[PDB]
């Protein structure tokens, strides 16, 4: 199976191809261009064609909401029209599961003025919260982009953590037991705050 996995959560937009359970392609670009300036021109430049894929994966964040809505719309449109499965994935979940620090794990990301974080235990997790300075117990996990922000008792910052790669590997695993994927009409960005 060959999966196209997309991530438009942040200005470091990235997409991956997953085959044989592993990443066979990843393109990652930090850009000040608008999301619609980059998509879908960046696919044409790299010869990425939606009909060449068996399945799709897309980040639902947390991330910048308008760029998430754009990326999710691209992917839902392709998956629905080609009759191919689609799998959504969550950035904060991936940051916790893939970082081998002790529990509790506090992945966090900054979107605009909000630091969103989520608290993971071995067998359970909290909702996505908004950070307000509180003293937190456990191990913060984030990106080098956000190195100036300290959550928890100690921090690990990933030099790079391309969500579309980890999300695509997850989607591959997901489709083994759930080959129909997730309902394409219901895929939407994660909304922490209301409008």
């Amino acid at each position: 199976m060959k999966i196209l996995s997309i991530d438009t959560s942040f200005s470091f937009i990235n997409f991956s191809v997953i085959e044989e359970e592993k990443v066979t392609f990843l393109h990652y670009l930090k850009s000040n261009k608008k999301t619609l300036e980059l998509l879908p021109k960046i696919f044409e430049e790299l010869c990425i064609r939606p009909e060449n894929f068996d399945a799709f994966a897309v980040s639902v964040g947390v991330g910048y909401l308008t760029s998430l809505r754009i990326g999710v719309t691209f992917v839902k449109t392709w998956a629905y029209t080609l009759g191919k499965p689609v799998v959504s994935y969550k950035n904060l979940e991936l940051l916790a599961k893939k970082t081998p620090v002790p529990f509790p794990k506090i992945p966090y990301l900054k979107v605009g003025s909000n630091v969103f974080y989520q608290i993971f235990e071995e067998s359970s997790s909290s909702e996505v919260k908004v950070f307000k300075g509180e003293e937190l117990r456990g191990y913060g996990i984030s990106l080098k982009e956000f190195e100036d922000i300290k959550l928890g008792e100690k921090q690990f910052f990933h030099d790079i953590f391309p969500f579309s790669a980890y999300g695509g590997i997850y989607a591959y695993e997901f489709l083994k037991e759930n080959p129909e994927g997730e309902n394409v009409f219901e895929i939407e960005p994660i909304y922490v705050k209301p409008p």
Binding site: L36, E37, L38, L39, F43, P50, R69, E188
Partner: protein, 328 residues
């Protein structure tokens, strides 16, 4: 020739398929009036979320009703500007998704350009003609010399007519979409309590409406709706008559959502009968936002050899006149 058109500039998600030989092949719209009503207005972030949820179900309905294959579409038409930028990008994303997937050209349309060509769906209008565009946020007069060639003649100096209906309806406590409620309620009035005119001089082609809210407070609910509506429609007709005399043009197109008002339609029709000018007003289903009018203007632009590059980006407000120079 055949196009799939995409409109998400404000609070309606609208898709349509138009064939220049067979006419309408499909047409689906979902309004967001229900969800914006608790706010007395359109909330931008909320509108963006609704477009994102609704665009795929609407497309599914369009495909099943029309029974068309996307492979048979020649180009994708879509509203680029003006509008709520967060809602615009959902429709543009969906259009470019399909355009790249099916290798079809992209053809941008200005939203008020769509309103102008909404009447061409029923009858072609000879150039040049005057266009009175009356929506929730626009009350403009343009001299249209050709497709893509729109001379701005005048517009609102405060509230557009659609907003004035909304403020008058709220001020009377009635609900928000104000226009249709006042249109229906005004049929009961009978007695017209006169209202003051703006401070600008006669012959000026600009508009003013927000001062009526001052005189409304300073004053029989059905007569209130009646008197407001009568003053407003009479202002619209007078400015249009001035525009025809200033320009020499005896062809008038009246479009936008407020062109669905039944009394407006009486008054402009009466005036066309008495003065002998040609009047074009669309079916009421084409007065309010739809993708069929976008499809028609897209046809006109595509047929002149104009397509957009893959990285084309929406914007909140390109003026109609500038847009037509840029894009044709």
């Amino acid at each position: 020739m055949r196009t799939l058109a995409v409109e998400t500039s404000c609070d309606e998600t609208a898709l349509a398929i138009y064939d220049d030989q067979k006419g309408v092949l499909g047409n689906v719209i979902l309004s967001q009036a229900v969800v914006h009503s608790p706010f007395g207005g359109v909330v931008p972030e909320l509108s963006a979320r609704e477009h994102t949820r609704n665009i795929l179900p609407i497309f599914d309905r369009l495909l099943k009703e029309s029974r068309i294959n996307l492979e048979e579409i020649d180009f994708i038409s879509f509203t680029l500007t003006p509008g709520l930028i967060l809602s615009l990008v959902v429709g543009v994303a969906f259009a470019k998704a399909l355009a790249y997937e099916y290798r079809k050209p992209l053809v941008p349309v200005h939203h008020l350009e769509g309103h102008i060509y909404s009447v061409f769906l029923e009858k072609k209008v000879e150039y040049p003609f005057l266009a009175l565009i009356i929506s929730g946020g626009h009350t403009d007069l343009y001299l249209v010399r050709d497709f893509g060639r729109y001379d701005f003649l005048g517009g609102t100096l405060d509230d557009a007519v659609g907003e004035a209906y909304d403020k008058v309806a709220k001020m009377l406590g009635l609900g928000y979409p104000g226009g249709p409620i006042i249109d229906r309620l005004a049929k009961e009035g009978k007695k017209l309590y006169p209202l003051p005119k703006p401070l600008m001089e006669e012959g000026n082609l600009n508009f003013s409406f927000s001062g009526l809210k001052t005189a409304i407070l300073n004053l029989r609910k059905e007569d209130i709706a009646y008197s407001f509506q009568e003053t407003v429609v009479e202002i619209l007709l007078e400015k249009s008559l001035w525009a025809m005399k200033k320009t020499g043009i005896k062809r008038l197109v009246v479009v936008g959502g407020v062109s669905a008002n039944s009394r407006l339609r009486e008054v402009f029709k009466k005036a066309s009968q008495e003065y002998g000018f040609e009047l074009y007003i669309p079916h009421p289903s084409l007065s309010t936002d739809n993708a069929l009018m976008i499809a028609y203007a897209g046809m006109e632009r595509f047929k002149r050899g104009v397509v957009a590059p893959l990285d084309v980006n929406p914007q909140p407000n390109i003026p109609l006149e500038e847009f037509g120079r840029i894009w044709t």
